[PDB]
Amino acid sequence: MEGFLNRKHEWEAHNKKASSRSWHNVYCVINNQEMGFYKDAKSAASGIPYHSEVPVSLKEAICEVALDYKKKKHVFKLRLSDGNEYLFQAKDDEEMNTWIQAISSA
Amino acid sequence: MEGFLNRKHEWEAHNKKASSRSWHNVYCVINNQEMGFYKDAKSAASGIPYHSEVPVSLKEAICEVALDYKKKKHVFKLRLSDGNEYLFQAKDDEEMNTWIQAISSA
Ligand SMILES: O=P(O)(O)O[C@@H]1[C@H](O)[C@H](O)[C@@H](OP(=O)(O)O)[C@H](OP(=O)(O)O)[C@H]1O
Ligand SMILES: O=P(O)(O)O[C@@H]1[C@H](O)[C@H](O)[C@@H](OP(=O)(O)O)[C@H](OP(=O)(O)O)[C@H]1O
């Protein structure tokens, strides 16, 4: 499963607020129980990472609709096992749910 | 880049005709200069291989429209560097070309 998604890094480990918190349009790929980030589809096929980011494991990840986040629509929350938390924005709700199911079933 | 494609194993290394030559509907994923095969999208996210197949490298691969193959339409040919050759069938020509560009640019 892959596609573009607006992403925001919210939390880091140990209840620390992430220092880098602006939204960025990234091309996401769910494969082999992990999620990789690329600038676009072409970088994804070539294996060139978003910002030297390493793919993250979706093992025991918590993924759900971000009701609490109100600054925008179709936003879902992803908390990785290591404590990092991201907010992802999809084009509409159907896609949002498509992503939530994909991740929750990895 | 990923999606379902009908696949046929044509050639093996050393100008040997592949022994296993029936068409099979497989879910293909182009990521990090390689191509993985899965039974479906869900197996792809989970990392469960098509038939214990290992992803193949697209490094120096030859990919083109299979003019010579006439038994069906929208079929492209992929020759890997190690000698293996596969024929892939897409739903239409646009998608076929989409796949040919994706692979040729990996
Ligand atoms: O450009 P900067 O320095 O990174 O600033 C951030 C940016 O404007 C984010 O869009 C904003 O998130 P929200 O849009 O979601 O408000 C975040 O606020 P935040 O502190 O609420 O996280 C800002 O700190
Ligand atoms: O079921 P089997 O034993 O695997 O038989 C093959 C199967 O019917 C393939 O569809 C056919 O390819 P084509 O459809 O493309 O004709 C192939 O012929 P082939 O020898 O031409 O490769 C057969 O050998």
Curated annotation (Swiss-Prot), chains A, B:
* Tissue and organ expression note: Isoform 2 is present in brain, heart, kidney and liver (at protein level).
Record's superkingdom?
Eukaryota
| Boundaries of every PH domain copy | 1-106
Task: State where the protein is found.
Answer: Cytoplasm, Cytoskeleton; Endomembrane system; Cytoplasm, Myofibril, Sarcomere, M line; Cytoplasm, Cytosol
What pairs make up the disulfide bonds?
none
Subunit: Interacts with ANK2. Interacts with CPNE4 (via VWFA domain). Like erythrocyte spectrin, the spectrin-like proteins are capable to form dimers which can further associate to tetramers. Interacts with CAMSAP1. Can form heterodimers with SPTAN1.
User: What's its job?
Assistant: Fodrin, which seems to be involved in secretion, interacts with calmodulin in a calcium-dependent manner and is thus candidate for the calcium-dependent movement of the cytoskeleton at the membrane. Plays a critical role in central nervous system development and function.
Identify its protein family: Belongs to the spectrin family.
Q: What is this protein called?
A: Spectrin beta chain, non-erythrocytic 1
Organism, scientific name:
Mus musculus (Mouse)
Recite the lineage of the species. Answer: Eukaryota, Metazoa, Chordata, Craniata, Vertebrata
Gene name, per UniProt, is: Sptbn1
From-to range in the entire protein, with total length: 2199 to 2304 of 2363
